[PDB]
């Protein structure tokens, strides 16, 4: 397939920590989704590529009832190393970090894999993680740290029936699981409910380490957020703790042209140095 | 320390029924009481190991039932001409040597193993007090590096006692008589297995016997084969 | 002893104090640490290994020791940080019907690797002969059953021994132990240690609508002012204790010595008496 | 037996303060009354040598 690329508006600003804040402006520095960024338009109308999991991903889904269910996060998707097969079965979610490689292909009955090895975690979460012209958008911010596989989520009932694209509007994500399992994750594999016996299309972005200034409401929720590396107006709204900038000139951060090449010029001399006749002499020095 | 009758000569072969009392328990765990027939000259020969199921040998000595707290080996009706000593083994507790008994004279009358695997010794004639003398029992048949062998010494008049026990490859337990002055060292795993004296204390004058099988935890091992001993004759 | 469990237990509050009242244990010698300090140390996963040995073999279970069972069925290196919990089981594992069920692998080639389970049933081959399966004069059954009987004495009774091997790899610790909880005190300047968040203040009743996932709570400028109770859901408020500045008004040590004390930031009800701005 | 080694104490020690003790420990609020029961021994564990 030729994976399209759609524009991702302001969406994917999750809560970094669990701290109540009322009517403040918090400037956090963490892995977030860059505003007005590109996200592949993989359409599930067949598709199942292996995406790179560099430091965190933002998954989306505009399925109808059960089209997109499950995740096959892992490092190599082999039987040597472990993996993660968090799926969403009938009103339940099974989370196992067992090293089930594969059987034939990630499709689904547990027809995703057929093997048996040693496991490390079986945290079977009982509560599941998941109107004619009323679809349902489900966003999941997957982020991995030294010893926690944090997973964020948010379910919003979108209404507009425009061509398939990310809607316009700020919407934070709430954490649900904090699996403390420690395993390196570098590859991302998705799967759809085949059930053979424009349907849906998942958006998969990429997180980057950036600074974001978030506004907390009086109740305790985030109403909006401003990036600090999108436009000079955003940098001005970040250097001053206020989303309303007055008229004038403000001194923002300094610019510096980063180098491009790198040369290391040492002298010609290319030979060996006496060490076998110095460290190990006839017997030794005195 | 066990209890055995000094001698037994009255009513030869009719009411002898020698045994070994002094246990005051239920023989510990596995009830396996062996009977050794020590004969002057050649090495002793096994007679019976369990309470029943006698090995390939004389069929007129069986029914070694454990009555009370002692195994009464029925010896009546065997024969009327024998000159040897019957020794019984018990007290199978963990790390407990001296399982043999005292000298029981079972001579009914008084007056009137060779080519199985191998039998070799060192021949320690006129042993100098001290030093380090090595005695081997190289066996060209059964493996001398996989089975559980033992070393037992006996002196004129005194009975036998456990002197050295060695497991497969991970145990070098020593007897309580040496208390550390004896160091067992295994030879090449495919040639033989020898011992070491390590500066004896004038009590090692007794004659040695290298047995291919254990005494108290005795297993069938197909057959019980012993070897002749040699006189130390220390000059301390 | 030849096929022992290897239960990998994790993600629980291991309360070892309960084990002191479950069964009348006879040996609780923990070689690694103390049972009092064990309940305050987190771990990743505990390996539970259970077996049954005689009474004279319980002493053989030690961090480094030789014997018929210490180096042939289960060996512990010189790093065991668990316990040697064991107890007699001569109440339900001894019937007069023939106890040909257990074994201890009397025959072996050499010492096994510590913390290893060798589940094998091949005939012991004592060298110098290819034994494709035969029982005579060269190759015997390397397994031998016990002789446990009810009408015996101490030392040769069925003793169940269970060890709990501990490990600390480069993984987040799951099992920590029990968690002591104290009573709640409201409207009183006291100390608090709520889930690592330590401090002092007056725990009062607040009207803040916390989100169902938020636990802590801060203020405009980096100060914790409200936390969520680890017990039944309740929104509290952490205000600092009663503090203030003290000033002394003195007419000088030349006419008199009577002085006045002004406490700043108080309503005369938190220390004649006068209340000013 | 000539080189002794004390055991755990219900309270932390003091710098430059000798810890000579000969009583029996008491876990919780259950006095074992001299005879060593469960979780109550003498803090006089002898160091083993070889
Ligand atoms: C996203 O990437 C594709 C190529 O991968 C590019 O054609 C597209 O223009 C990008 N997004 C924008 C700027 O529309
Ligand atoms: C804040 O919460 C209160 C009580 O639930 C609610 O009445 C009010 O509308 C909320 N305001 C906002 C903007 O969240
Ligand atoms: C703890 O147990 C009590 C029992 O009444 C219950 O009311 C409370 O909600 C529980 N809290 C937690 C943390 O489960």
DSSP for B88-152, please give it.
E-----TT---------B--SSS----SSS-------TT--SSS----B---SSS-TTTS--EEE
CA of C180 to the centre of ligand 3 (A): 15
Taking residue B154's Cβ as centre, other Cβ atoms within 10 Å add up to 20
Q: Which of C172, C174, C217 sits opposite A20 (nearest CB)?
A: C217
How many domains does chain A divide into? 1
Residue A127, in any domain of the structure: yes
Q: Is D42 helix (H, G, I), strand (E, B) or coil?
A: coil
Q: Is B64 helix (H, G, I), strand (E, B) or coil?
A: strand
Distance (Å, whole) CA A86 – CA A94 = 6
Q: Is B156 helix (H, G, I), strand (E, B) or coil?
A: coil
Distance (Å, whole) CA B214 – CA B32 = 12
How was this model experimentally determined? cryo-EM
3-state helix vs strand vs coil in chain D, percent to 5: 0, 0, 100
Taking CB atoms and an 8 Å limit, are A220 and C209 in contact across chains? Answer: yes
Residues 6+ apart with CB under 8 A from A168: A9
For residues A132-157, one letter each, b for 16 or more C-beta atoms within 10 angstroms of the residue's C-beta and e for the rest, the string is eeebebbbbbbbbeeeebbbbbbeee
Residue A88, in any domain of the structure: yes
Taking CB atoms and an 8 Å limit, are B173 and C108 in contact across chains? Answer: no
Q: If we measure between CA atoms, which residue out of A84, A43, A73 comes closest to residue A192?
A: A43
Distance (Å, whole) CA C219 – CA B134 = 86
* CA dihedral of B212, B218, B224, B227, whole degrees rounded to 10: 40
Residue A273, in any domain of the structure: no
Paired with C162 in beta bridges are C50
Does ligand 1 have an atom closer than 6 angstroms to the CB of A36?
no
Distance (Å, whole) CA B143 – CA C138 = 9
**With contacts defined as CB-CB under 8 Å, which chain C residues touch B168?**
107-110
Q: If we measure between CA atoms, which residue out of B165, B44, B143, B53 comes closest to residue B98?
A: B165
Residue A241, in any domain of the structure: yes
Place of tokens 């968040």: C197
Residue A276, in any domain of the structure: no
Q: Tokens at residue B66, please?
A: 């454990």
What separation in angstroms does the CA of C235 have from each of A176, A218, C201, C244? 20, 16, 15, 27
Query: For chain A, how many residues are written?
Result: 286
End-to-end CA distance of chain B: 29
Sheet holding A208-216, edge to edge: A25-32, A208-216, A222-227
Residues in A 172-211 with any Cβ partner in C closer than 8 A:
174-176, 180, 182
The chains in contact with chain D, meaning 3 or more Cβ pairs closer than 8 Å, are C
Paired with A144 in beta bridges are A149
DSSP per position, chain C: --S---EEE-SS---GGGGGTTS--SB---SSS-HHHHTT--BS-EEEEEEEE-GGGGGG-SBS--STTTTTT--B-TT--S---EEE-TTTS--TT---S-------SSPPPSS------PPP--SSS--SS--SSS---S-------SS--TTSS-EEEEEEE----SS---B-----------SSEEEEEETTEEEEEEEEE------TT--EE--TTS-----B-SSS--BEEEE--S--EEEEE---TTT----EEEEES--SS--------
Distance (Å, whole) CA B223 – CA C137 = 7
- CA C162 to chain B, closest CA, distance in angstroms equals 21
Burial of A189 (0-12, 13-18, 19+ CB in 10 A): buried
Distance (Å, whole) CA C8 – CA C47 = 5
- Please check whether residue B35 is in contact with residue B72, taking contact to mean a CB–CB distance below 8 angstroms: no
Strand B45-48 with B35-38, pairing: antiparallel
CA of C177 to the centre of ligand 3 (A): 19
φ and ψ at residue A148, rounded to 5 degrees = -150, 135
Distance (Å, whole) CA A186 – CA B122 = 70
**With contacts defined as CB-CB under 8 Å, which chain A residues touch C171?**
147, 182
- Please check whether residue A39 is in contact with residue A10, taking contact to mean a CB–CB distance below 8 angstroms: no
Place of tokens 């030093």: B131
Q: Tokens at residue A5, please?
A: 């690329």
Paired with B211 in beta bridges are B150
Distance (Å, whole) CA D12 – CA B22 = 55
Burial of C188 (0-12, 13-18, 19+ CB in 10 A): exposed
Q: Tokens at residue C246, please?
A: 């003290």
Place of tokens 């009397």: C106
- CA C77 to chain B, closest CA, distance in angstroms equals 14
Strand A87-89 with A92-94, pairing: antiparallel
CATH of the domain at A219: 2.60.120.960
Burial of A164 (0-12, 13-18, 19+ CB in 10 A): middle
Nearest CA to ligand 3 atom 3: C232
Residue in C179, C230, C231, C234 to alter for ligand 3 test, most ligand atoms within 8 A of Cβ:
C231
Residue A286, in any domain of the structure: no
- What string of H, E and C letters represents the secondary structure of C157-174? CCEEEEEEECCCCCCCCC
Domain hosting residue A92, numbered range: 5-256
Q: If we measure between CA atoms, which residue out of A226, A235, A232, A240 comes closest to residue A34?
A: A226
Residue A268, in any domain of the structure: no
Angle (CA) B34-B216-C55 rounded to 5° is 125
Q: Which of C108, C137, C146 sits opposite B222 (nearest CB)?
A: C137
């Amino acid at each position: 397939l030729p994976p399209a690329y759609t524009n991702s508006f302001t969406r994917g600003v999750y809560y970094p920590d669990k701290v109540f804040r009322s009517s403040v402006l918090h400037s956090t520095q963490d892995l977030f989704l860059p505003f007005f960024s590109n996200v592949t338009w993989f359409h599930v109308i067949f598709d199942n590529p292996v995406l790179p999991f560099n430091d965190g991903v933002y998954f989306a889904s505009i399925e109808k009832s059960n089209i997109i269910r499950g995740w096959i996060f892992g490092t190599t998707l082999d039987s040597k190393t472990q993996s993660l097969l968090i799926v969403n079965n009938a009103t339940n979610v099974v989370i196992k970090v067992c090293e089930f490689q594969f059987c034939n292909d990630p499709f689904l009955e547990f027809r995703v894999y057929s093997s048996a090895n040693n496991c490390t975690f079986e945290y079977v979460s009982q509560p599941f993680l998941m109107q004619g012209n009323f679809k349902n958008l489900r966003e999941f911010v997957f982020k991995n740290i030294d010893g926690y596989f944090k997973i964020y989520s948010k379910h919003t009932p979108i209404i507009v029936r425009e061509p398939e694209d990310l809607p316009q509007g700020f919407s934070a994500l709430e954490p649900l699981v904090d699996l403390p399992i420690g395993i390196n994750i570098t590859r991302f594999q998705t799967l759809l409910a085949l059930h053979r016996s424009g349907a849906a299309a998942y958006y998969v972005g990429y997180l980057q380490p950036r600074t974001f200034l978030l506004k907390y409401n009086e109740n305790g929720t985030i109403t909006d957020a401003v990036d600090c590396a999108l436009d000079p107006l955003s940098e001005t709204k970040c250097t001053l703790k206020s989303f309303t900038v007055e008229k004038g000139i403000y001194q923002t951060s300094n610019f510096r042209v980063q180098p491009t090449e790198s040369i290391v010029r040492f002298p010609n001399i290319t030979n060996l140095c006496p060490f076998d006749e110095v460290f190990n002499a006839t017997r030794f020095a005195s | 320390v066990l209890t055995q009758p000094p001698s037994a000569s009255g009513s030869p072969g009719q009411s002898v029924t020698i045994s070994c009392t002094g246990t005051s328990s239920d023989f510990g765990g596995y009830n396996s009481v062996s009977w050794y027939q020590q004969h002057p000259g050649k090495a002793p020969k096994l007679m019976i190991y369990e309470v029943s199921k006698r090995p390939s040998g004389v069929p007129d000595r069986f029914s070694g039932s454990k009555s009370g707290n002692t195994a009464s080996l029925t010896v009546s009706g065997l024969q009327a001409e024998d000159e040897a000593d019957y020794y019984c083994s018990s007290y199978a507790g963990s790390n407990n040597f001296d399982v043999f008994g005292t000298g029981t004279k079972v001579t009914v009358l008084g007056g009137g193993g060779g080519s199985e695997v191998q039998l070799v010794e060192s021949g320690g004639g006129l042993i100098q007090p001290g030093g380090s003398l090595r005695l081997s029992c190289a066996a060209s048949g059964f493996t001398v590096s996989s089975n559980y062998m033992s070393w037992v010494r006996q002196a004129p008049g005194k009975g036998l006692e456990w002197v050295s026990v060695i497991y497969s490859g991970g145990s070098t337990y020593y007897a309580d008589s040496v208390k550390g002055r004896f160091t067992i060292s295994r030879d090449n795993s495919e040639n033989t297995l020898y011992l070491q004296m390590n500066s004896l204390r004038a009590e090692d004058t007794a004659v040695y016997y290298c047995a291919r099988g254990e005494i108290q935890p005795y297993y069938y091992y197909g057959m019980d084969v012993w070897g002749q001993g040699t006189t130390v004759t220390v000059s301390s | 002893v030849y096929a022992w469990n290897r239960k990998r237990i994790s993600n629980c509050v291991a309360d070892y104090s309960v084990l002191y009242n479950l069964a009348p244990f006879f040996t609780f010698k923990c070689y690694g640490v103390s049972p009092t300090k064990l309940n305050d140390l987190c771990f990743t996963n505990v390996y539970a290994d259970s077996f049954v040995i005689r009474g004279d073999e319980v002493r053989q279970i030690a961090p480094g020791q030789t014997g018929n069972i210490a180096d042939y069925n289960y060996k512990l290196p010189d790093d065991f940080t668990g316990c040697v919990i064991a107890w007699n089981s001569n109440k339900l594992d001894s019937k007069v019907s023939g106890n040909y069920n257990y074994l201890y692998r009397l025959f072996r080639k050499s010492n096994l690797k510590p913390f290893e389970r060798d589940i094998s049933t091949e005939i012991y081959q004592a060298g110098n002969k290819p034994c494709n399966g035969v029982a005579g004069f060269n190759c015997y059954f390397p397994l031998r059953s016990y002789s446990f009987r009810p009408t015996y004495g101490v030392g040769h009774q069925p003793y169940r021994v269970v060890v709990l091997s501990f490990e600390l790899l480069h993984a987040p610790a799951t099992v920590c132990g029990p968690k002591k909880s104290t009573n709640l005190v409201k409207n009183k300047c006291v100390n608090f240690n709520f889930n690592g968040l330590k401090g002092t203040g007056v725990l009062t009743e607040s009207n803040k609508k916390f989100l169902p996932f938020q636990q802590f709570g801060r203020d405009i400028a980096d100060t914790t002012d409200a936390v969520r109770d680890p017990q039944t859901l309740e929104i509290l408020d952490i205000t600092p204790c009663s503090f203030g500045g003290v000033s002394v008004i003195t007419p000088g040590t030349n006419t008199s010595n009577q002085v006045a004390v002004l406490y700043q930031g108080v309503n005369c009800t938190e220390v004649n008496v006068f209340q000013t701005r």
